[PDB]
Amino acid sequence: SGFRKMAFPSGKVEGCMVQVTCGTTTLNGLWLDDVVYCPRHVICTSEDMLNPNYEDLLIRKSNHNFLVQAGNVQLRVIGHSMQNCVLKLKVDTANPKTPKYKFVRIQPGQTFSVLACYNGSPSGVYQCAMRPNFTIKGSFLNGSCGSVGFNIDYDCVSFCYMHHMELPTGVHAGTDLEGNFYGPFVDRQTAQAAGTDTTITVNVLAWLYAAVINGDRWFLNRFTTTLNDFNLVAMKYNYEPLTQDHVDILGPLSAQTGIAVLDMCASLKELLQNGMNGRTILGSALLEDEFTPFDVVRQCSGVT
Amino acid sequence: SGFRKMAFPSGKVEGCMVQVTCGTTTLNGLWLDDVVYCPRHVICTSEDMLNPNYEDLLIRKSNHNFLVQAGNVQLRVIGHSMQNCVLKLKVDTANPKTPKYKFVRIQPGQTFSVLACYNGSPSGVYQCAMRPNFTIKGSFLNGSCGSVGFNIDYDCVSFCYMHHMELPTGVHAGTDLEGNFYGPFVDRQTAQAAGTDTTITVNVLAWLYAAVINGDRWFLNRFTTTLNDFNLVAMKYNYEPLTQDHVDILGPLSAQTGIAVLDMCASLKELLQNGMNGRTILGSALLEDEFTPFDVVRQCSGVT
Ligand SMILES: c1cnc(N2CC[C@]3(CCOC3)C2)cn1
Ligand SMILES: c1cnc(N2CC[C@]3(CCOC3)C2)cn1
């Protein structure tokens, strides 16, 4: 019993982190096979970041200008290319610790683990969600760029995020490993405001199932609702609309607990309208939305 | 910027997890050098756990009755001994992935990372604190026993916890790696009620410093207090008494922020008396107490 914000074990990703330096800029790279992936802004001065022309800045860079260090050993860069907002540095040595991997582009509301790194060295691991406004609420200091987000399916690491930027509001933006930003963000130090950070309703409902499984039951009420009625309340409270697809995804938790999804929606509706009244659910005083239905099943079943 | 509940990178500990089976009981072991450490209750049936005589049950066990599997390779057990509530299984092979390590017994209020494991396989990593009543609020299913808690100082893993038990109230109890339980708990399926789960005041104050560093400032008020005045309020709210030693430990965060420790205590006093009024601090609607002053400095400074 018990329910924790849990990250994937990080060792398979630790084995891929390297340091990338270009001139005076140092950040992190991801070494998979004989390619190191890193933010293309490694080539920028902080001056450059105000209005960078990446193709033009990259013309002035040679393979030997990209210093890649794996632990305290230098890797030889034999090619480089820009793909969207990432650089791919071809090295002469395959990472011997390369895990089974995929590159995936996740949808808003999907969770992942971040291995926060500085100078190619892991500092910590935490669980994130892709917010509905395509930001993440991370913990990233200067030097953390190139830190990655991932999920694991048994022995296969699906890399879904690489850290690039902090918005002036202190939320985070980055790319998939093909270098495409999540959301409308760009790798430029300019006015970039995030949209509404709506609550991921299907994830809240998953977590309320997790709470029931773990004996936190006080919020279960005598009511049901419909998707349309629930969605009127969701809209009012800046929750994501619940779709039939979300109801289908919660089916296994409904089955396990015997609480119909729409009954749990009616419990959530009352929580939104009534608040917590100073009570807690799974040690939280707010409704937690960074567990997906799959996360709840995984943690409640002991998947390795 | 941003502040996350962050675990240590788990790879060094992943490299030490093994499966231990004795008869029909399977749980996790920690393989360091040529010793595997595991809960002594691996020798119990669930029947045995009601009133086990561990010395008597262990007489019926031989080295060959302890099946130790590291990945999908069997380790040869060449000796066993009981130390307090742990077994030490001597194997014929030093773990080649043994990190630099220490065994430490932590104090209540100290935080650590848990690598939750089943059948010797890592499932996830999360951050815990030793509660003032010597329980932890973990996420542990049947099979997670022998999962460990640790801190890392650069390349040295300090193991501080091994999981043994879930109390009937669904909180967790375990031992240090010398097999001594934290608190008054025993490895028997009996009436074991936890004492008051008081809030770790020095950790709350650390987190309020973290909040200020990260721009969450609304709760800063115009007041100061004294330790004795603060402690009258702490006692009323089931907070740990603040000592001069705690004030000294918060000195670096006071310095960094320019907020005197007793001024932050007066801000905390007002939060306790007034509540949050529906506001949040670092995305929390309650006062978080599972960051130590050292954790706040570490995460705010990017230590690897
Ligand atoms: C030395 C150290 N680690 C090596 N690995 C091979 C691939 C992994 C990651 C996925 O499984 C194991 C790591 C190889 N040689
Ligand atoms: C193969 C794979 N891993 C090995 N390791 C030696 C000790 C560590 C843990 C601490 O640093 C590295 C792991 C050795 N051989």
How many other β-carbons are positioned within 10 Å of the β-carbon of residue B274? 10
Angle (CA) B24-B71-A99 rounded to 5° is 145
**Cβ-based neighbours of B56, under 8 Å, separated by 6 or more:** none
CB-neighbour burial class of residue A160 (10 A; exposed 0-12, middle 13-18, buried 19+): buried
Which of B249, B263, B256 lies closest to B220 in space, CA to CA?
B263
Q: Specify the amino acid at residue A144.
A: S
C-alpha count within 13 angstroms, C-beta hemisphere, residue A25: 21
The 3-class SS string of A30-64 reads EEECCEEEEEHHHHCCCCHHHCCCHHHHHHCCCHH
Question: What distance in Å separates the CA atoms of residue B139 and residue B172, rounded to the nearest whole number?
Answer: 9
CATH class of A198-301: mainly alpha
Give the distance from residue B278's alpha carbon to the nearest chain A alpha carbon, in angstroms.
9
With contact defined as beta carbons under 8 Å apart, do B208 and B281 qualify?
Answer: yes
Phi, psi for residue B72 in degrees, rounded to 5: -110, 25
Size of interface A-B (CB pairs under 8 A): 153
> Could you tell me which residues are beta bridge partners of residue A125?
A115, B7
- CA B91, CA B34: separation in Å to the nearest integer? 5
A21-32 as b/e: b if 16+ CB within 10 A: bbeebbbbbbbb
CA distance B294 to B275: 26
- The answer to whether A85 and A180 are in contact (CB under 8 A) is yes
Three-class SS state of B297: helix
Interface of B with A in 83-142 (CB under 8 A): 114-119, 121-126, 137-142
Burial of B251 (0-12, 13-18, 19+ CB in 10 A): exposed
Residues A255/A247, Cβ–Cβ less than 8 Å = no
- What secondary structure, in 3-state letters, does A18-30 show? EEEEECCEEEEEE
Say whether B274 sits in a helix, a strand or coil.
Answer: helix
Tokens of A233: 């309340």
Q: B129: which chain A residues are within 8 Å (Cβ-Cβ)? A: none
With beta carbons under 8 A apart, name residues in chain A contacting B284. 284-286
- State the burial class of residue B27 (Cβ atoms within 10 Å of its Cβ: 0-12, 13-18, 19+): buried
On the CB side of A67, CA atoms within 13 Å amount to: 12
Task: State the DSSP H helix or E strand holding residue A116, giving kind and residue range, or none if neither.
Answer: strand A111-118
- Which-ligand-closest: CA of A12? 1
Rounded Cα gap, residues B150 and A232, in angstroms = 46
Query: Rounded to an integer, what distance in angstroms lies between the CA atom of residue A225 and that of residue A83?
Result: 47
Half-sphere exposure of A256 (CA within 13 A, CB side): 18
DSSP per residue over B185-206, as a string? --SSSS--------B-HHHHHH
Q: Which of B16, B22, B38, B41 is catalytic?
A: B41
**Calpha distance A244→A202 (Å, rounded):** 11
Task: Give which of B159, B152, B154, B157 is closest to B106, Cα–Cα.
Answer: B159
Distances (CA, A) of A262 to A201, A227, A266, A267, B22: 12, 7, 6, 9, 45
Q: Residue A54 and residue A78: Cα distance in Å, rounded?
A: 20
Contacts of B303 in chain A (CB under 8 A): 123
Give the DSSP letter string of A207-259.
HHHHHHHTT--TT--S----HHHHHHHHHHTTBPPP-HHHHHHTHHHHHHHT-
Residue type, B261: V
Those residues whose C-beta lies under 8 Å from the C-beta of residue A53, and which sit 6 or more positions away, are: none
Way it was determined: X-ray
Rg (CA), chain A: 21
Domain A1-14+100-197: give its CATH code: 2.40.10.10
Q: How far is B150 from chain A (nearest CA, A)?
A: 13
Domain ranges of chain B: 1-14+100-197, 15-99, 198-301
Fold agreement (B15-99, B198-301) = no
Distances (CA, A) of B32 to A62, B26, B82, B103: 45, 19, 16, 11
- Gap between the Cα atoms of B213 and B216, Å rounded: 8
The CA distance from B87 to the nearest CA of chain A, in Å, is 24
Nearest of A152, A104, A153 to residue A130 by alpha carbon: A104
Angle at A208 between CA A197 and CA B284, to 5 degrees: 50
| CA–CA separation, B161 and B134 (whole Å) | 11
Q: Is residue B270 within 8 Å of B223, Cβ to Cβ?
A: yes
CA distance A303 to A152: 11
- Which residue, judged by its Cα, is nearest atom 10 of ligand 2? B99
Quote the strand ranges of chain B, DSSP E: 17-22, 25-32, 35-39, 66-70, 73-75, 77-83, 86-91, 100-103, 111-118, 121-129, 148-153, 156-166, 172-175
Contacts of B245 (CB under 8 A, 6+ apart): none
Q: Which residues form the pocket of ligand 2, taking CB atoms under 6 Å from any ligand atom?
A: B 12, 15, 96-97, 99
Q: How far is the CA of A10 from the centre of ligand 2 (A)?
A: 15
Q: Rounded to the nearest 10 degrees, how much is the dihedral formed by the CA atoms of B130, B135, B141, B147?
A: 40
**How far is it, in rounded angstroms, from Cα A222 to Cα A281?**
18
State if residue A14 touches ligand 1 by the CB under 6 angstroms criterion.
Answer: no
Substitution target from B199, B274, B304 for chain A, most A beta carbons within 10 A: B304
CA distance A157 to A26: 25
CB B293 within 8 A of CB B112: no
Q: Are strands B100-103 and B156-166 parallel, antiparallel or unpaired?
A: parallel
Contact A258/B at CB under 8 A = no
Cβ pair A172, A140 in contact under 8 A: yes
Q: What distances in angstroms separate CA B276 from CA A219, B206, B268, B283, one per listed residue?
A: 21, 18, 11, 12
Residue A84 has which token pair?
């969207």
| C-alpha atoms less than 13 angstroms from C-alpha of A117 in its C-beta half-sphere | 33
Nearest protein Cα to ligand 1, atom 11: A99
According to DSSP, the residues that pair with B102 across neighbouring strands are B158
* Non-local CB neighbours of A2 within 8 Å, separated by 6+ positions: A214, B137, B138, B139, B140, B166, B170, B171, B172
| C-alpha to C-alpha distance for A82 and A102, rounded to whole angstroms | 19
**CB-count burial class (<10 Å; 0-12, 13-18, 19+) for A182:** buried
Residues of chain B positioned with their CB less than 8 A from the CB of A131? none
| Partner B, chain A 54-83, Cβ-Cβ below 8 Å | none
Q: What are phi and psi of A155, to 5 degrees?
A: -125, 5
What is the DSSP code string of A143-204? T-TT-EEEEEETTEEEEEEEEEEE-TTS-EEEE-TTSPBSTT--SSSS--------B-HHHH
CA A262/CA B14 separation, integer angstroms: 40
Residue of A97, A150, A153, A156 with the most ligand 1 atoms within 8 Å of its CB, for mutation: A97
- What is the distance, to the nearest Å, from the Cα of residue B85 to the centroid of all Cα atoms in its chain? 17
User: What is the three-class DSSP state of B253?
Assistant: helix
State both tokens at A124.
Answer: 């910590």
**Distance between CA B304 and CA B294 in Å, rounded?**
13
Is A164 catalytic? The answer is no
Q: Name the one residue in this structure whose structure tokens are 């419909």.
A: A226
Q: How many CB atoms lie within 10 A of CB B13?
A: 28
Alpha carbons within 13 angstroms on the beta-carbon side of residue B67 total 12
Amino acid (one-letter) located at A118: Y
Using a CB-CB cut-off of 8 Å, the residues of chain A touching B121 are 304
Residue B99: name the closest of B165, B181, B167, B154 by CA: B154
Q: Is A145 a catalytic residue?
A: yes
Report DSSP letters for B108-151, one per residue: TT-EEEEEEEETTEEEEEEEEE--TTS-B-----TT-TT-EEEE
From CA A199, how far away is CA B161, in angstroms rounded? 36
Q: Report which bound ligand comes closest to the CA of A101.
A: 1
Polymer length of chain B:
304
Is residue A15 within 6 Å of ligand 1 at its C-beta? yes
Alpha-carbon distance B245 to B232, whole Å? 18
- From CA A290, how far away is CA A279, in angstroms rounded? 20
A16, A28, A126: best to mutate for the B interface, most B CBs within 10 A = A126
- Please tell me the total number of residues recorded for chain A in this structure: 304
Query: How far apart (Å, rounded) are the C-alpha atoms in residues B165 and B173?
Result: 5
Taking the C-alpha atoms of residue B226 and residue B231, their distance in angstroms, rounded to an integer, is 8
The domain covering B15-99 belongs, at the CATH homologous superfamily level, to Trypsin-like serine proteases (2.40.10.10)
Quick one: CA dihedral A195, A296, A14, A106, positive or negative? negative
- Are the beta carbons of A20 and A42 closer than 8 angstroms? yes
Q: Atom 2, ligand 2: which residue's CA is nearest?
A: B97
CA distance B182 to B164: 11
Q: Are A187 and A139 in contact (CB under 8 A)?
A: no
- At residue B163, φ and ψ (nearest 5 deg) are -75, 130
Q: Is residue A23 within 8 Å of residue A45, measured between CB atoms?
A: yes
